[PDB]
Design a protein that fits this description.
Chains C, D: GO terms for molecular function: DNA topoisomerase type II (double strand cut, ATP-hydrolyzing) inhibitor activity; protein homodimerization activity. The structure is a homohexamer. Chain A has about 180 residues and is mostly beta strands. Chain A has 2 helices and 11 strands; from the N terminus they run E-E-E-E-E-E-E-E-E-E-H-H-E. Chain A has one domain: Pectate Lyase C-like (3 Solenoid). The radius of gyration of chain A is 17 Å and the shape is elongated. The termini of chain A are far apart. Chains A and D meet through helix 2 of A and helix 2 of D.
């Protein structure tokens, strides 16, 4: 149980931090590649510019946490509990985050290149400036989420759930101009 | 002036009908190919399955007239004033109808292939079952018009103006669910 | 009168109560002061005619044309309009309150100071009508075709409008909804 | 500063360039004239503080609170705001042009004469904010929560709004869409 | 071929007017019960307050015609071609008008009690003041048609096609109040 | 003042916690039945699967708190100030929550049977999978809230305020097609 402590440039490569608990712990540029963080729980922790290469995170809970700038590569992220998680400028490209609930998560400037977000729930998620080339959002629920016109044109969105307002934004991303009655 | 008269199967090829006025005139299977119909005025007439290959109809006026099945090939149709004209089954492929107000006009099963319809006004028109391959609807006013899903996926629509229903159906025609 | 025509004719101050017309085409005829109460008209036209202080209440027009006719201080209510055209007609200052105008062609129609509160204009074409100072308070405008300029000059307190029309209004007031 | 508190403290006219704070809770402290350029803040609060002629450009606030703080003639642009609260903050007369305020809590916020042209307020909560004379020309307001009164007092020339919002605007201007 | 002529109180009961043509013919209070008007064609004709009891009208064409006040009872109306037909105050209760195209037809104050309008196309039809108790509008296309709130509550509308604006009107006919964003 | 402390399986029945303040307090399976919690203030606390039978919580304040699975029976919940409270799996059956602003509150799988929610503000709330049998949402502000089709067919909605999406889904939940 790491509480109210900082860490920087710390190397945790290949260690077993199962069931780990942290509270207001802040890590910067730490490497957790190969680490097993299954069942871990974190409250108000920050993972600024950290590396999670082949990191195991399933069945974990992150509440009010920051993932600013971190790089996730082929991680086991499902299931997982992200309640108020900031993924600003993070890289999740290539990862499989299928069926994960990402409601109210900050995905601003987040890399989602070839990220598998199928059947994900992104209601109200801020996806502004996210790089989504090759991103898979099929059957995802985007209702109320904040998305730029580039997503509405480069993401497979088959069976993806959107609202009327978003129906209009998606149409203008393709050239149509709304005029009504 | 021809009125309350019929004409079936006659060839008017290359004749000059400038300034002609017809009323409740019925023309079935007539060939108006090469005919000059500039300034013509029509009220309640029918041009049923007529051939219109290279005909000049600009500055004309059709009011409550039918073009059921007639075929237009390289015709001069603009400017032109249509006031409730029925284009059911007509062939307008490759013609230029830019700027034509086609408000509340029936275009059911109409062929609009390679048809230039840019800036056209289609408010309230019925295009159910029209063939729109290569159809150009850029900047067209599509408000309140009825259109099949296939249209959204075949016509160029850059700047085409639509209603909430159409914007929604556009996304639908692309698999997004609402 | 049936299947007859009347050009230039001057009917000023005559009494045509309960008059009936079928396909009667009155072109450029005056009807000022005339009393046409309880009259019925079917398929008739009233091309560019004058109606100055003409009484027309409790009347009935079906598949009729008013192409051009001018109306002034006429008593038009109640009135029953069925497929009646008003392309270019001039209704300035007239009082049409309560009239039901569903699907009425009012293209290029004039409506300055025209009072139309509580009117039902569902699906009525006001395309290019002059609506300056027009009174449309509490009127049903749903699915009626109009120009952006009306959304800016007409008093529309309590007027009913549908979602598409709402989009039109916010635009005609400088907001941008075209992409959004 | 990390995990520390500061009540009543008076920082007037100090120089805190490139300053960093993590969970620093400044309650009722003055920062007038202070220079906070290039500063970074994470999870900090600035409860009822004063910022009179405070320089804050090129800064960064993440998961921060500004609950109550007053801002006056401050240089706030460019500024990077991430999950920043402004409940009750006073931004009158300030210039926030170009700032990106997606999902910013601006409830009970004050915005009189506040200049926010071209701002991005997508999903921003302006619930019960005073927006008198507020400048929102060309701003993106889509899916942002607002009160009808703003639709009537804010200049919104070229502001972007979505269909639902259009419905809201035409209403706040007396039209009836509730049934229709 | 009846042209430019009137008729009043005329009794045509049980006669064979097959392939009949009329133009600007006007009938008032005429009885066509039992009449066979198959393949008939009419232009600008009027059938003011007329009786069509068990009348055969299939494969006929009415263009610019008035049916004001007439009573249709168990008629064979399909297929049939109604192009600009006025059915103001007419009674079509009980009739089977399934699959008929009724586009731009005046149905104002029209009785449709137990009228079978399934799979009908009523785009832009004015249905204001129509009495629709027991009316069957399943799979009908009502887009843009003018309808009162009573229809939106007493008509079977399963699979019936309506537009967004009508989606709102139907919701308010049930008590919901639209407010948007 | 209890802070950064846990409480598991304890019975507070009929105690008086008036004006109590808790922070990051975690209560799992605690019975607050009969307890007086008037004026209480909470910040970041969790009441996980707690029993709240006849408890007084009026004039309270819950900020970023969880009510995951807790069960409320004949409780005094109004007025009340909720600021981001998670009601996932909570039982609010038959309680009176009239006028409560529940903006952006999670009500996933929440039981709202015979729950009085008239005039409530639910702008942006998540009701996915809530049980709304006998639920009263008359005049409630439903704008932008997520709701299953089943809700439209079970709750009284007279005057409930909705968005274009909801109005459309209401008609859908009644078989009309758009």
């Amino acid at each position: 149980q790491w509480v109210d402590c900082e860490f920087t440039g710390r190397d945790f490569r290949d260690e077993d931090l199962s069931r780990l608990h942290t509270e207001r712990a802040m890590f910067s540029e730490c490497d957790f590649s190969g680490v097993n963080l299954a069942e871990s729980q974190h409250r108000g922790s920050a993972f600024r510019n950290c590396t999670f290469e082949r990191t195991t995170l399933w069945h974990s809970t992150f509440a009010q946490c920051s993932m600013l700038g971190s790089v996730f590569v082929a991680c086991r992220l499902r299931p997982l509990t992200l309640d108020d998680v900031d993924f600003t400028l993070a890289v999740l490209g290539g990862n499989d985050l299928r069926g994960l609930n990402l409601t109210g998560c900050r995905l601003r400037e987040t890399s989602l290149v070839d990220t598998d977000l199928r059947k994900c729930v992104l209601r109200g998620a801020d996806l502004s400036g996210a790089r989504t080339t090759g991103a898979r959002l099929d059957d995802a629920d985007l209702r109320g989420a904040t998305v730029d016109p580039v997503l509405w044109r480069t993401a497979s969105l088959v069976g993806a759930r959107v609202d009327v307002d978003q129906a209009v934004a998606f149409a203008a991303a393709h050239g149509l101009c709304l005029a009504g009655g």
